Amino acid sequence: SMEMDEKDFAADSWSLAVDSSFLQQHKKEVMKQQDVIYELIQTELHHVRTLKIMTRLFRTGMLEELHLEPGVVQGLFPCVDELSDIHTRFLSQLLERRRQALCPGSTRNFVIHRLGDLLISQFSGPSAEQMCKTYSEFCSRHSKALKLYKELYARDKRFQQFIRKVTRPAVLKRHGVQECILLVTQRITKYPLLISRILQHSHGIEEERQDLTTALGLVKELLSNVDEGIYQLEKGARLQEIYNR
Amino acid sequence: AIRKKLVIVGDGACGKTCLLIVFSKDQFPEVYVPTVFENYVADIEVDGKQVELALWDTAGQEDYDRLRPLSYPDTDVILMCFSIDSPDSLENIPEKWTPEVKHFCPNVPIILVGNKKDLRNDEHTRRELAKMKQEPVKPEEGRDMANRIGAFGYMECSAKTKDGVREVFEMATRAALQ
Lengths: 245, 178
Ligand SMILES: CS(=O)(=O)N1CCC[C@@H]1CN
Hints:
Chain B: Residues 59-76 are annotated as: Switch II region. Chain B: Its EC number is 3.6.5.2. The complex is a heterodimer of chains A (245) and B (178). With 245 residues, chain A is an all-alpha fold. Chain A has 13 helices and no strands. In chain A, helix 6 (80-101) crosses helix 8 (125-155). The longest helix of chain A is centred in the first third of the chain and has 38 residues, at 28-65. Chain B has 178 residues and is α/β, with parallel strands linked by helices. Chain B has helices at 16-24, 87-104, 123-130, 139-148, 165-177; strands spanning 2-10, 40-46, 49-57, 77-83, 110-115, 153-156. The A-B interface holds A 12-13, 15-16, 35-36, 39, 43, 46, 139, 142-143, 146, 173-174, 178-179, 182-183, 185-186, 188-190, 192-194, 197, 223-224, 226-228, 230 and B 29, 31-32, 34-36, 38-41, 54, 56-57, 59-61, 63-67, 70-71, 73-74.
């Protein structure tokens, strides 16, 4: 992550991120709504950061330092460039909504009143089709990636030294290769939990309550489609094992 | 330190996310209780042994039968949760959660955990449950269910007061080491 965004999302909540004299100007219901929107953006910033660890630290480091056989790095990190493009674009829209809402003279005081429209746009049309295709592929290649990683770590000394070297810093404690893969798979099922809680505190403007209700429905339709499109790939699986599913 | 993986499973209202947040946080969440839990790697020393225990939640995956099992690979210990204020969450343990965990995590110890133990003596909870001919889960009902499903053990905790939370994760670490 870049320092500007890390500092803007360093606090545990929106109520602790804004100036106390700005917080005091708002009703409790607005504070509860903004705390959950802040959690959605903060966790999206961390999710994009997980994808940058996968592309820049692991994937590119293996290509630039190791002698792995062709197609090994793609098997360890399936769809990572596509996932990074989807989420970096979504994060850019969330951060621009926050930035446009800042008070003049402030880099931290803002209220986002219209999140629903942004979520409907993300979870409909081509961007939703791309999310569905990419997660159906990623989640079907998840078990294969974990097994490929375990095999390389157990048999290749240079691969083992590379992993231990780049995961040694304390800031990587939660972000080893297998942990990143599971963090990405679990991201999509966090959205309904966050959207439902934002909706619980967005009844003040009927247009907003309706837009978040529509967005929650689109997210659930996407998850149902992804879940129906998963069949775990296994290295060396025979056709007979597949057609006898 | 040896690395071990823990996954918590249970119905949507069981309190699994809150339990992971309260254990992992240094200060109890007095200002904002997070909606979700990403992951965490806890440094735990139990009975003289140092372990890095990776913690994972299945919240949000309850309705997605092909996404949810992706959380299970290489799990060393399962916390199987129900809420004491929800006898319905305990009924779903033996024929939904238990066969799933035994299939995807063969031979992995399961600790059955009764969450929200503070509600056992909460008057609002007792009044609401009494309208559906129910009462908070009794300790013997939790132990009998743990015994029946082949659980490694039965434990109770309250994420709200923190009582029993440290003991649950220290015991999960011991189970993961066996
Ligand atoms: C591709 S998707 O899962 O997001 N989905 C839902 C809406 C329309 C589209 C289906 N045609």
